[PDB]
Amino acid sequence: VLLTNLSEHMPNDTRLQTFLELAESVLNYFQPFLGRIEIMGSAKRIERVYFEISESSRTQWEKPQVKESKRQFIFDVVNEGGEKEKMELFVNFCEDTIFEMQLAAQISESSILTVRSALFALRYNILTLMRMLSLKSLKKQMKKVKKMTVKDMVTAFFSSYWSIFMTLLHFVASVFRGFFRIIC
Amino acid sequence: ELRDQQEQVKEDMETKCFICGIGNDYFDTVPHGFETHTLQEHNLANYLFFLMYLINKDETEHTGQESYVWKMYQERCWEFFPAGDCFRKQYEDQLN
Amino acid sequence: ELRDQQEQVKEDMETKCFICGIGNDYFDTVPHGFETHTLQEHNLANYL
Amino acid sequence: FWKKIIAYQQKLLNYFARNFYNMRMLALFVAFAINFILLFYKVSTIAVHYVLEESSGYMEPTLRILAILHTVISFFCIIGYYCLKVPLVIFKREKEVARKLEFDGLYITEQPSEDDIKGQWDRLVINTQSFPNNYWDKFVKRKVMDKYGEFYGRDRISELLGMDKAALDFSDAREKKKPKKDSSLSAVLNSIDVKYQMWKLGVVFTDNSFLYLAWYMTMSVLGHYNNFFFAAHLLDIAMGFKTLRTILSSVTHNGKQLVLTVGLLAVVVYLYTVVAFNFFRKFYNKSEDGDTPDMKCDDMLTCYMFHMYVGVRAGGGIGDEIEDPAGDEYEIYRIIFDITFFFFVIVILLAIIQGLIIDAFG
Amino acid sequence: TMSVLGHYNNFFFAAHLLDIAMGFKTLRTILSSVTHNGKQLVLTVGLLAVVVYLYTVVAFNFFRKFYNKSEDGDTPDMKCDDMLTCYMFHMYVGVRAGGGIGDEIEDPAGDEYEIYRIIFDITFFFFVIVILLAIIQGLIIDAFG
Numbered sequence A: 001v002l003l004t005n006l007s008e009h010m011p012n013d014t015r016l017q018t019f020l021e022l023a024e025s026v027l028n029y030f031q032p033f034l035g036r037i038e039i040m041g042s043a044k045r046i047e048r049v050y051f052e053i054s055e056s057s058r059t060q061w062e063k064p065q066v067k068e069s070k071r072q073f074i075f076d077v078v079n080e081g082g083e084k085e086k087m088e089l090f091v092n093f094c095e096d097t098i099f100e101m102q103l104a105a106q107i108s109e110s111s112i113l114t115v116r117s118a119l120f121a122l123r124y125n126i127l128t129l130m131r132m133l134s135l136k137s138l139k140k141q142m143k144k145v146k147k148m149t150v151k152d153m154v155t156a157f158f159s160s161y162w163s164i165f166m167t168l169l170h171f172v173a174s175v176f177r178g179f180f181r182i183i184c
Numbered sequence B: 001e002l003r004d005q006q007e008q009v010k011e012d013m014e015t016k017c018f019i020c021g022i023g024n025d026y027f028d029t030v031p032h033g034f035e036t037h038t039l040q041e042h043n044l045a046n047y048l049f050f051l052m053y054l055i056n057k058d059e060t061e062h063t064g065q066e067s068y069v070w071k072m073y074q075e076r077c078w079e080f081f082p083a084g085d086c087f088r089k090q091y092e093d094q095l096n
Numbered sequence C: 001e002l003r004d005q006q007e008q009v010k011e012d013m014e015t016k017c018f019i020c021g022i023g024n025d026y027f028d029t030v031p032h033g034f035e036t037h038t039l040q041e042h043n044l045a046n047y048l
Numbered sequence D: 001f002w003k004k005i006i007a008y009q010q011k012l013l014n015y016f017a018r019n020f021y022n023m024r025m026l027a028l029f030v031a032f033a034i035n036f037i038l039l040f041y042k043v044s045t046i047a048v049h050y051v052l053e054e055s056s057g058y059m060e061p062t063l064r065i066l067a068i069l070h071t072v073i074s075f076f077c078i079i080g081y082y083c084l085k086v087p088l089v090i091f092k093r094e095k096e097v098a099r100k101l102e103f104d105g106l107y108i109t110e111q112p113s114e115d116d117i118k119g120q121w122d123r124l125v126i127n128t129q130s131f132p133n134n135y136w137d138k139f140v141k142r143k144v145m146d147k148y149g150e151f152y153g154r155d156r157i158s159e160l161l162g163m164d165k166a167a168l169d170f171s172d173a174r175e176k177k178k179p180k181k182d183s184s185l186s187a188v189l190n191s192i193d194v195k196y197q198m199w200k201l202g203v204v205f206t207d208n209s210f211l212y213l214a215w216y217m218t219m220s221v222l223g224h225y226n227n228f229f230f231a232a233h234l235l236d237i238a239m240g241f242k243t244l245r246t247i248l249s250s251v252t253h254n255g256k257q258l259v260l261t262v263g264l265l266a267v268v269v270y271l272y273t274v275v276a277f278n279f280f281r282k283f284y285n286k287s288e289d290g291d292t293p294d295m296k297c298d299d300m301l302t303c304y305m306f307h308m309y310v311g312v313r314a315g316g317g318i319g320d321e322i323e324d325p326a327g328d329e330y331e332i333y334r335i336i337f338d339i340t341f342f343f344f345v346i347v348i349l350l351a352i353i354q355g356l357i358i359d360a361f362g
Numbered sequence E: 001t002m003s004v005l006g007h008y009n010n011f012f013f014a015a016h017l018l019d020i021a022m023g024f025k026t027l028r029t030i031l032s033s034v035t036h037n038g039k040q041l042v043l044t045v046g047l048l049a050v051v052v053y054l055y056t057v058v059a060f061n062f063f064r065k066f067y068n069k070s071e072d073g074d075t076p077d078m079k080c081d082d083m084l085t086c087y088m089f090h091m092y093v094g095v096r097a098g099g100g101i102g103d104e105i106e107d108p109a110g111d112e113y114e115i116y117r118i119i120f121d122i123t124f125f126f127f128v129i130v131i132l133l134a135i136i137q138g139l140i141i142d143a144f145g
């Protein structure tokens, strides 16, 4: 808190900057806990106030119910609200939220199958498709390709994508069967 | 009308700071200045946490600033909230 | 259109003073300055 | 000829990629032509078969030729997609995985969410030699090692990224090196990176647009066995024209609200059906002859289906269909029943649907 | 030309009542409320025609026996034996009907396709009668706005 106050009030002191760099890790540990606000000070001048935000308070604040209440309160104060009563309504909301957060802290006192099936279907079906290339049985086809043939080359080019499409069909069917088994 | 109400709420929330009420452009003269102001300087969550701290902290152990805010909160006077002014405006000359 | 007319009336009434026509922000540089101006300095009831 | 064949394949690939959209429009035009011809089918003699009726007689051969053309053009559309759009999908996925690996440590600092098909499939590609194949940054693996190598282990990160710790420096060391020549069968089959190609095929299969084109393929093929399967291809106008997509987006914009409205209508109708089944069963005789009474609300499910079908489709509510209540001890009760049904179901809920559509437009 | 032809047939003078649109500006405002989204309105009708054609295909394939619009059993009047006839049936008395095609075609009770035809009729009512006409009306209202 001391170093943050000094840094914020003096932003262009190289000595302070180097000192903060030396103090980097400690100032990073307490960053979630250090809370800072600005108030209209007693000396007719805006002042910065530093305090400790507790971990339990922060967790209860970012609980989803408190966020829903915050959104509702903001909607209310923005639609039906006056700048005269805005800060009174905000303090009433703060009091209610603090009470509910403290009560929540008090009371709180101490599919994978589908994904795996789909992925296995992909792996098995793609390996099945690639086996025909990996079998080294394309020797007879290579011999038939040694002599250049337009019909042969267009047939091979189209047959590759036809085989890919058939593999996709088999994969879809396998996924459907697996999902049917899982649900039934 | 419901859609317009939602849009008005979001536009106000994103165009002016909730506490001080200053427009976003003034803070945005510095890049990301509006989000820096609304998330670090003037944060409603930070004010709520300050109220929690003040309530849960003993009267004797209060600092001068804390005692000032406590007295004005007990008497329900809300002038301690920055209204129309901020750190940047107040120290504009020296800070910038 | 009726709803938009009502909203336009309220927005104009709340954003600028009825008599002088100056925007609310200029008066709002002082806290509560707009309501002070429109309720104490420039008040249509006061003119009536 | 090893280079000439590759050149010819390149020319064909480029042609399909360049003419991909024209083929997609031609497919829709052929679909409209086929359906226009199918609009002149009739049923005839009992054995049931569908025969084309026309004065020309040439339309049936025209239909055969058009079906063959549609099937060929659709295959050409799949090829054009795989030539043109698939590289962009691979580039995007291969960039996202690189950014997640480097600036998030999605396979080093932490592990996939155990339900992310994309994540556990992309876990394969990191070990492939042919990684940044499409993405420009060819130094992704080195960047990852420079970031996480010291803290988590350079050797295991090298294993994870499929690079060589003790072989890279040995290569820069002094030894004799031997060149290779690509057109050899062993050389080309070794150059084929089976793992990276498997990952790429998985990504393509998981792509949505490729799946849509495969469905188009299946419908086009099935149209040969039953010609009316070509009618499913008229569902492609939505993705064919942007202007129609605007009108359809006016509906799909509030689709969740529209589904919830139908669910609420179903619940309200079920409550009305419960009331009718408890108190107004004798008004549901939909039989003209008195000999056989046809009771529509003796069974709960039958009464619910009655209310859903001819209670909602009716212009004035269920009271338009069920009998008049005059001169009965429950007359006012059934009057309230019918009026409230008309107001809540026919008037308000349909107004909610229409208002959702209008608000989506706005 | 219309004025001259009115002398041969006096009812040709009725075509001149189509001049009020360009005669009065106030009526032109109401008509512009329609013509503002004319392309969208035409595309909506085309989409309605396509959807009705799909429904007609389904009916012609599976629900042909429900389209007997003949009272006397001696002469059965089959409205969906022919594809074009069934399509015209669906366009005319399927769309003009207040409750969809199920208001006109016969009741499905006690049949093996009962639930299928129930879904058919309910979906027809929802998509054609409810949603698409709502799209037309919403286009008009949005044009006003």
Ligand SMILES: Nc1ncnc2c1ncn2[C@@H]1O[C@H](COP(=O)(O)OP(=O)(O)OP(=O)(O)O)[C@@H](O)[C@H]1O
Binding pocket: A067, A071, B013, B014, B016, B017, B018, B019, B034, B035, B038, B039, B042, B043, B044, B045
């Ligand atoms: N005084 C203020 N305090 C907090 N936010 C403010 C303030 N003035 C303006 N804002 C703006 O209000 C926005 C809403 O903040 P917030 O992130 O809490 O809302 P959200 O988008 O509804 O999500 P969530 O509440 O889940 O985080 C902030 O992004 C911020 O730019």
Ligand SMILES: Nc1ncnc2c1ncn2[C@@H]1O[C@H](COP(=O)(O)OP(=O)(O)OP(=O)(O)O)[C@@H](O)[C@H]1O
Binding pocket: C013, C014, C016, C017, C018, C019, C034, C035, C038, C039, C042, C043, C044, C045
């Ligand atoms: N010259 C002006 N005189 C009065 N009010 C003004 C003037 N310029 C702006 N206003 C604004 O008009 C608002 C409307 O005032 P007023 O309170 O009379 O209206 P209201 O909310 O409709 O209720 P009511 O008339 O019952 O008090 C005031 O709150 C004020 O901020």
Ligand SMILES: [Zn+2]
Binding pocket: B017, B018, B019, B020, B021, B022, B037, B038, B042, B086
């Ligand atoms: Zn502020």
Ligand SMILES: [Zn+2]
Binding pocket: C017, C018, C019, C020, C021, C022, C037, C038, C042
């Ligand atoms: Zn004034």
